[PDB]
Amino acid sequence: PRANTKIIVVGGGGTMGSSTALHLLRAGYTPSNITVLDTYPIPSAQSAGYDLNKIFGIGLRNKPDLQLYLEALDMWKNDPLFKPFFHNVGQMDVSSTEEGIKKLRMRYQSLLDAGIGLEKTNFLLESEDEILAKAPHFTREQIKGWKGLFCGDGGWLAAAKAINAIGQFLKEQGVKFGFGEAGTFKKPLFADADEKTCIGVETVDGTKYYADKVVLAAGAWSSTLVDLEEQCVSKAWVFAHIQLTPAEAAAYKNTPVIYDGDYGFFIEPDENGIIKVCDEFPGFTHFKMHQPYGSPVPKLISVPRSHAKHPTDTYPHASEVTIKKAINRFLPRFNDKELFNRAMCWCTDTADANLLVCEHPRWKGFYLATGDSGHSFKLLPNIGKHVVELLEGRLESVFKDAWRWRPGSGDALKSRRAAPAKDLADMPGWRN
Ligand SMILES: *Cc1cc2c(cc1C)nc1c(=O)[nH]c(=O)nc-1n2C[C@H](O)[C@H](O)[C@H](O)COP(=O)(O)OP(=O)(O)OC[C@H]1O[C@@H](n2cnc3c(N)ncnc32)[C@H](O)[C@@H]1O
Numbered sequence: 001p002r003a004n005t006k007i008i009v010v011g012g013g014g015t016m017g018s019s020t021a022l023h024l025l026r027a028g029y030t031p032s033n034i035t036v037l038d039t040y041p042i043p044s045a046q047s048a049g050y051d052l053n054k055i056f057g058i059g060l061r062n063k064p065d066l067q068l069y070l071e072a073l074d075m076w077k078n079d080p081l082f083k084p085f086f087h088n089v090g091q092m093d094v095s096s097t098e099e100g101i102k103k104l105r106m107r108y109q110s111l112l113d114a115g116i117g118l119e120k121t122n123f124l125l126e127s128e129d130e131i132l133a134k135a136p137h138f139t140r141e142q143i144k145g146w147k148g149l150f151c152g153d154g155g156w157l158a159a160a161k162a163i164n165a166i167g168q169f170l171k172e173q174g175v176k177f178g179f180g181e182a183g184t185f186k187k188p189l190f191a192d193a194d195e196k197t198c199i200g201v202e203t204v205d206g207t208k209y210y211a212d213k214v215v216l217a218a219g220a221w222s223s224t225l226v227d228l229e230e231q232c233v234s235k236a237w238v239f240a241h242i243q244l245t246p247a248e249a250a251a252y253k254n255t256p257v258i259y260d261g262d263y264g265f266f267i268e269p270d271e272n273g274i275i276k277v278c279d280e281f282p283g284f285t286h287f288k289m290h291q292p293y294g295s296p297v298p299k300l301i302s303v304p305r306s307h308a309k310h311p312t313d314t315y316p317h318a319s320e321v322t323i324k325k326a327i328n329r330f331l332p333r334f335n336d337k338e339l340f341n342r343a344m345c346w347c348t349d350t351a352d353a354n355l356l357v358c359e360h361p362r363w364k365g366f367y368l369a370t371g372d373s374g375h376s377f378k379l380l381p382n383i384g385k386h387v388v389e390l391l392e393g394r395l396e397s398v399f400k401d402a403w404r405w406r407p408g409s410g411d412a413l414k415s416r417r418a419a420p421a422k423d424l425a426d427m428p429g430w431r432n
C-alpha cells in the first residue's frame with residue numbers, strides 16, 4: 001500500500017522531481033518513506049527551474065499536450081500552493097516576416113482545430129492598433145509590419161519561488177533528503193546480478209539507499225547517469241538580465257510576455273525591476289567523456305556544465321549577440337542597459353519533444369521521469385500526478401504511449417528544433 005511503500009526521487013530538488021515528491025505526499029505516501037536525493041538542496045541551484053520566471057503558454061505539438069496544458073492551467077489558477085506564482089498577463093507572439101506570419105496564422109488555426117473553443121481566449125492581431133492595445137510599451141514605428149497572436153490564458157510563472165514552495169512543504173512534512181555527494185546518484189542497486197530488480201541507489205560518496213521504487217528525475221543530467229541510448233540529448237539555453245528603475249518599469253507593468261521565434265522573448269520586470277531576456281536558437285551541447293550506468297563502456301555524451309558549480313561561467317559570445325538583438329527588437333529604449341547574471345540553463349531533448357516517463361525496460365522498480373525537452377516548467381503542478389500514476393500502473397495510454405521507452409525513434413540532437421545543436425567546444429567566450 002502507499003503508506004508502506006518507500007520511494008527514492010533522484011533529482012527531487014528540481015522540476016519533475018519536486019512535483020513527483022509533492023504528489024506522493026498528496027496520494028498518501030508516508031513522508032519518512034520518501035527520500036529526495038539531489039546534489040543541491042531544494043530548490044536546486046542548478047535546476048532548470050531555478051529561475052526568476054518561466055512562460056506559461058499553450059502548445060499543441062504532441063498528442064498529450066492539450067490535456068497536460070489544461071490540467072496545469074487549472075492548477076496554476078486554483079491550487080493554493082501554486083496560484084500565488086502564476087501571473088496571467090497573457091502572451092503575444094509576433095512576427096514581421098512572411099514565413100513568421102504564416103507560422104503565427106497556422107498556429108492560430110491549429111488552436112481552433114482542437115474544436116474545444118480556444119478561439120474565445122486566443123486571437124490573431126492583424127493591425128498595429130490591436131498590438132498596441134495589448135502591449136502599450138511599443139511604439140508605432142517599432143511595430144510597423146508586425147502581426148500578432150495573443151493567447152489570453154497564459155502569462156509567466158515565478159519559477160524558483162514555486163519549487164521552493166513545494167520544498168517548504170516537503171520539509172515541513174518530514175520528507176528525507178540527501179544533498180552533495182550523499183545526494184548525488186551514482187548507480188542503481190539490484191537484488192541480483194541479472195539487474196532485473198532495482199532495490200535502491202548508491203550515491204557517489206558510497207551511501208546506499210534502499211526503496212521499493214526509484215524515480216530518475218535528473219533533468220539534463222539523466223542521460224549522463226544511466227544509459228538512455230541517445231533518446232535524450234542535453235542542451236543549454238541562455239538568458240541575461242537587465243535592471244530597470246521603478247519609473248522605467250512602470251510602462252511594463254502587467255504587460256503580456258512578448259515572443260518572436262526569430263528573436264526570443266522577454267518577461268515583464270519582477271518586483272525588483274528585473275527583466276529577463278532569452279534569445280531563440282536550437283541550444284548548445286557540451287559533449288564530454290562520461291560513463292552512464294547500464295553502458296558497458298564510456299559514451300560521448302552532452303554533459304551539463306553547471307553554473308551553480310562554476311558560477312564564473314556565463315555564455316558564448318554568439319549568445320551575447322543574439323540576446324542583444326532581442327533587446328533591440330523588443331526593448332530598444334534599453335539598448336544601453338548593462339546585461340548581467342548571464343547564464344546557461346540546461347534541458348534534455350527527446351527526438352519528438354515528448355517526455356520520457358516510463359519504467360526502465362530491464363530494471364524493474366526503476367522509473368525514468370525526464371525528456372523535459374525545454375518546455376516542461378509549466379507542468380510543475382501536474383506532472384508529478386502522472387509519475388505517481390505510472391509508479392502505480394495506472395497511467396492512461398495517451399500519456400503512456402507518448403512517454404514510452406523508445407530508443408532509435410529519431411535524432412534528438414536536432415529534435416523538433418531548426419538544426420542540430422552546436423557544441424560549446426566550438427563556441428568561444430563562456431568560460432570568460
Ligand atoms: C533552460 C531554460 C529552460 C526553460 C526556459 C528557459 C531556459 C533558459 N523557459 C521555459 C518556459 O518559458 N516555459 C517552460 O515551460 N519551460 C521553460 N524552460 C524549461 C524548463 O526549465 C525545463 O523543461 C524543466 O524545468 C525541466 O525539469 P527537470 O526536472 O527535468 O530538470 P530540473 O528541473 O533541472 O531538475 C533536475 C535535477 O536533477 C538534479 N541532479 C542532477 N544530477 C543529479 C544526481 N546525480 N543526483 C541527484 N540529483 C541530480 C539537479 O540538481 C536538478 O535539481
Ligand SMILES: O=C(O)CSC[C@@]1(O)OC[C@@H](O)[C@@H](O)[C@@H]1O
Nearest residue numbers: 055056057237278281373374375
Ligand atoms: O514552452 C514554452 O511555453 C516556453 S519554452 C522557453 C524556452 O526558452 O525554453 C528553452 C527552449 O525550449 C527554448 O527554445 C524556449 O524558447
